[PDB]
């Protein structure tokens, strides 16, 4: 039966590679050596907009935030395509699929955002750029407190040294959360998630044999994820109290 | 089935997103309009007393017009949700996304409005109601002329007998139009629409194997869609002068601006 867990792990890894262009191995190779444009202050931001091809350009902090929402929309679509590859997901109730995605995209977005972050900054524009953590902190309030929680999460999460094949199953586990509010049929969701959790346990034990309870710690990280999301939507409504048409319909979330 | 399987997967994806984005599909509209139910029967509005009676379970011409406006805003929200699910759409330039929605939203609105129509009237309020064509024609000028072109187009267009799986790809093709005014990068939009047109051609061949050249006729209906949108914006340009005390919805204002 363990061969079946390995088959599921390989399937999810292949789908993960198909769905996410900027993998953690690529981002890690860019952050060490293999040449992204670094944005460290306002002038390097200017030259970045004049040199890098950004798609969100129609105050500076509002612009940075709006780009980080463009990327979030793209991410939601990639996560949707990946979720459709999880065995049993498409056979679920359609409303349940919509609910699972609706409540999972944020936790997955920050999980994978950790893959593009180190203690000093975050990759941007499919790895073409690297915006420093200090330049993000230097943004005016409340926009200066948006990314620091994500950095603090990414340090501890990256300390687990997970690879893409681990993150594929971990993300698949996040999607199939049977406690999302409004679900109509929880039984098949929790069944799929139990199979995915078995696959994740076997994967972590075969891929990290020196880490005794890495599975448990990875499960413990999900509480931190829900804290980052829960405390992020607060900054999102306060952000709705600091920014006063057709563009706002595209970004009714993020 | 070589690369046809990729187009079939794209069709299934678009149909799934379609069902997830529009709560009143054509299938449910036809189940309501015909007689497949005793639970899906609508309340029929055809005069003043049936309107006043039907205002329990969800000026007069102004009220109906505002209802059409609210339904239009809701439709723009649903079409936006569906557009974000078109592969490659959210990867385009943001300005081009705004433009594509801006010029495609009403063509899609009337296309799907055909699904809620017969020759006698149109479903309203999620199918709970059904307002007749002649009651809409009886409204004061020029509100009485607002819906007739939509009814004529819907009569000609419903003859193609498309189901929801066809309409998903068709409205996807409508969104990814490279001839919209003001687009920055036409080439990617045209690549996506080339893929969507392949998917639509295959879907119409497999779903309607007896409908000869249904692809061409469906593509030709976009002319009628264009003419309908133009006549509507002209009517609006009259209403803006006759009714100085009425307001168009801000989203609708931004849509119609420089159309
Ligand atoms: C209160 O009674 C109601 C309630 C809702 C109804 N919906 C419809 C028909 O649905 C329509 C018709 C036209 C449009 C296009 C329009 S109209 C406008 O002002 N701006 C647009 O973009 C969009 C939806 N009718 C007849 C209604 C009657």
The separation between the first and the last C-alpha atoms of chain A, rounded to the nearest angstrom, is 40
**B92 neighbors B129 (Cβ within 8 angstroms):** no
Of B15, B20, B7, give the one whose Cα is nearest residue B169.
B15
Query: Are the beta carbons of A74 and B91 separated by less than 8 Å?
Result: yes
Q: How far apart are CA A5 and CA A11, in angstroms?
A: 10
- The whole-angstrom distance between B15's CA and the closest CA on chain A is 12
Burial B176-197 (b: 16+ CB within 10 A, else e): bbbebeebeeeebbbebbebbb
* For the CA of B65, the nearest atom of ligand 1: 19
Q: List CB contacts (< 8 A) between B250 and chain A.
A: 245
Rg (CA), chain A: 19
Is B101 at the interface with chain A, CB within 8 A? yes
How far away is chain B from the Cα of A227, in angstroms, using its nearest Cα?
27
Task: Enumerate domains of chain B plus CATH numbers.
Answer: 1-259 (1.10.565.10)
Lookup result for tokens 């990759």:
A123
Q: Whose structure tokens read 């000609």?
A: B156
Sign of the CA dihedral with B186 first, then B173, B118, and B69 last: negative
The verdict on A73 touching B (C-beta cutoff 8 Å) is yes
Which token pair is A18?
A: 């198909």
Chain A CB within 8 Å of residue B175 CB? no
Q: Is the Cα torsion angle B245, A249, A176, B87 positive or negative in sign? A: positive
Count of A-B CB contacts under 8 Å: 51
A112, A75 Cβ separation under 8 angstroms: yes
For A92, other C-beta atoms within 10 Å of its C-beta total 20
**Whose alpha carbon is nearest atom 25 of ligand 1?**
B68
Phi, psi of B130 (to 5 degrees): -150, 105
Contact A246 B102 (CB under 8 A): yes
Ligand 1 center–CA A57 separation, angstroms: 34
Q: What is the number of alpha carbons within 13 Å of residue B123 lying toward its C-beta?
A: 23
The rounded distance, in Å, linking the Cα atoms of A161 and A214 is 10
Question: Which among B16, B91, B98 is the nearest to A247, CB-wise?
Answer: B98
User: Are residues B132 and B121 in contact, defined by beta-carbon separation less than 8 angstroms?
Assistant: yes
Give this entry's resolution in angstroms. Answer: 2.5
**Pick from B161, B133, B146, B139: which is nearest to B45 by CA?**
B133
Binding-site members of B are 69-72, 106, 232, 256
What phi, psi does B152 have (nearest 5°)?
-65, -45
């Amino acid at each position: 039966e363990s061969a079946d867990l390995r088959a599921l792990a390989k399937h999810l890894y292949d789908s993960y590679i198909k769905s996410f262009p900027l993998t953690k191995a690529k981002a890690r190779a860019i952050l060490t050596g293999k040449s992204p444009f670094v944005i460290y202050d306002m002038n390097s931001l200017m030259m970045g907009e004049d040199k890098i091809k950004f798609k969100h350009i129609t105050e500076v902090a509002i612009r940075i935030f709006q780009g980080c929402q463009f990327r979030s929309v793209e991410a939601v679509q990639e996560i949707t395509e990946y979720a459709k590859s999880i065995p049993g997901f498409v056979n679920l109730d359609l409303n349940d699929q919509v609910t699972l995605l609706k409540y999972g995209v944020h936790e997955i977005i920050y999980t994978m955002l950790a893959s593009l972050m180190n203690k000093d900054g975050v990759l941007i524009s499919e790895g073409q750029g690297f915006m420093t953590r200090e330049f993000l902190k230097s943004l005016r309030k409340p926009f200066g407190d948006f990314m620091e929680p994500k950095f603090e999460f990414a340090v501890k999460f990256n300390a687990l040294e997970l690879d893409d094949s681990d993150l594929a199953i971990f993300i698949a586990v996040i999607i199939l959360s049977g406690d999302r509010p409004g679900l109509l049929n929880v039984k098949p969701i929790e069944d799929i998630q139990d199979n995915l959790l078995q696959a994740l346990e076997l994967q972590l034990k075969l891929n990290h044999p020196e880490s005794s309870q890495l599975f448990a710690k990875l499960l413990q990280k999900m509480t931190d994820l829900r804290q980052i999301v829960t405390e992020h939507v607060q900054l999102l409504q306060v952000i709705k109290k600091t920014e006063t048409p057709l563009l706002q319909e595209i970004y009714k979330d993020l």
